[model samples]
Target: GHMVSKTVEVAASAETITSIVSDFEAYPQWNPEIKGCWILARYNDGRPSQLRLDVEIQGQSGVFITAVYYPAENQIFTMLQQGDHFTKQEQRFSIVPLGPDSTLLQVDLDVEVKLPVPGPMVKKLAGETLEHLAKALEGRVEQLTQ
Candidate 1:
């Protein structure tokens, strides 16, 4: 499995960022890699508990079922429940309040595929994916705040 992590500072509160990240159905609008997202189930409070996402990973397009969890108000974790292209996948988003009008966003991604790909190529792809997600989140936060 290859793992990559990225962090970004956004001019928004942790709560605001969490809300944006938790809205699975809105992902396609902000996340370029997520071509489609559908909530399969929801929690009692209406937050998505499970979802299916159409995404492109390392240039391979596939659909994966993922379980969503809110470990804390400012954190969201997702793990692959069923998928054919990838052997395993996990992603986490953490938000920390830096100030009243500032927050830090961190994303961690771990993925393993079934193909016989090189380790270096997997690492590079993971890094680029994390970078794209971080930048997209920052832009989303700015758009909502403005």
Candidate 2:
């Protein structure tokens, strides 16, 4: 498995960021690799409990079903339930309040692919994936808050 993580400061509150991240259906608008996303099930509180994603990673496209969990108001965790291309996958997002109007967002991703890939390439891909997500999330927060 390959692991990668990234952290970014955002000009918004944790609640605001959580609202955006928990809206699974809106992923395609900000995440370029996620072509589509939909909630498969929801918690009693209305948060997504499971989801299906149509994504393209490393030029290979696949459908993934993931179980979503919220350990706290400012944290989200998702683990792969079914996917052909990946043997295992997990993604986590944690938000920490920096101030009344600022927050620190951290994304951690771990994945194991069915096919073997060079170590450097996997690192590059994972790094780039987190980078893109962080940038897009910042842009989205700005757009919604402005």
Candidate 3:
């Protein structure tokens, strides 16, 4: 039950940040671990309900994940339906509105690895992942607005 939480201030609205987070197709451009992502189904209001993801880490391949999106809470909870490294996983986003064009973005991540590895390595990876993700969000927002 490894958990990592990261927060950053984004120069965009909660709506703008949330929209980027919800846009599954844009994940690969920002997230290094996600090789490909797509929405499998949509809710009546046109929000994504189900998503299919292809993740690649350390040159390992053939991992797939199906995730459910909870738009009402600005969260997308994921489960490893088919993957090698992760046995159980959940990732969520928390967005706070600071102003019309200012927002606070936080990401909460939990992952259970199936691979047998050293505890220290897992901890290190978790730390790097969170730190990198926060930076990625910052850069993505800047790129989109420019």
Candidate 4:
């Protein structure tokens, strides 16, 4: 198992970023990987404890993943299947104020899965996925700014 980390910064206020991050239910609107999300449970503070997300990859079979969200640290841990292998995925997002009209947004992830594909190939896929996420986050930053 190999662990890879990627981080990207986006422009926005911590408040705005926290608001969006707090509402895991609105993931489909901003999250790049999530195609759709259905709430499973919420705490008294309205933070999601569990959720079901449908990913855009691999058609509809990749849908219906149960997510265990740990909000105290702004992280979500997901257990889903990727290419017949069960993958363990983790995501963390945050925003920090940079002046009056900027935010430093980021996502960090750790994934564990034994892919049948070659190691180099798997690494490439992971790199592409991370890049896609960075691009998506940048897109959100642009949308919120404009």
List, residue by residue over 1-146, the lDDT tens digit for candidate 3.
Answer: 56777788889888889888878889999988889888877789887667777777688764555666674576566655656676766777888898778998877777777888666777677777878877888888898895
Better of 1 and 2 by TM-score: 2
What are the per-model numbers of colliding residue pairs? 0, 0, 0, 2
Clashing pairs in 2: none
lDDT of model 4, residue 51: 69
**Which residues of candidate 2, in runs, are more than 4 Å off?**
56-60
For every candidate structure, what is the RMSD over all alpha carbons to the true structure, in angstroms? 2.2, 2.0, 2.3, 3.4
All models: lDDT? Answer: 0.86, 0.88, 0.77, 0.62
Best of the two (1, 4) by TM-score: 1
* Candidate 4: residue 77 Cα off by (Å): 5.7
Candidate 3 residue runs with Cα over 4 Å from true position: 118-120
Best-to-worst order by TM-score is 2, 1, 3, 4
Q: Give Cα distance to truth, residue 73, candidate 3, Å.
A: 3.7
lDDT of 1 at 82: 87
Candidate 4: tens digits of C-alpha lDDT, residues 13-118? 7676666666656767877568777777776777666667677655544555555556556444454433224466665655556788666765665555555666
TM-score of every model?
Answer: 0.88, 0.89, 0.82, 0.71
User: Highest lDDT among the candidates is held by which one?
Assistant: 2
Residue 1 of model 4 has an lDDT of: 30
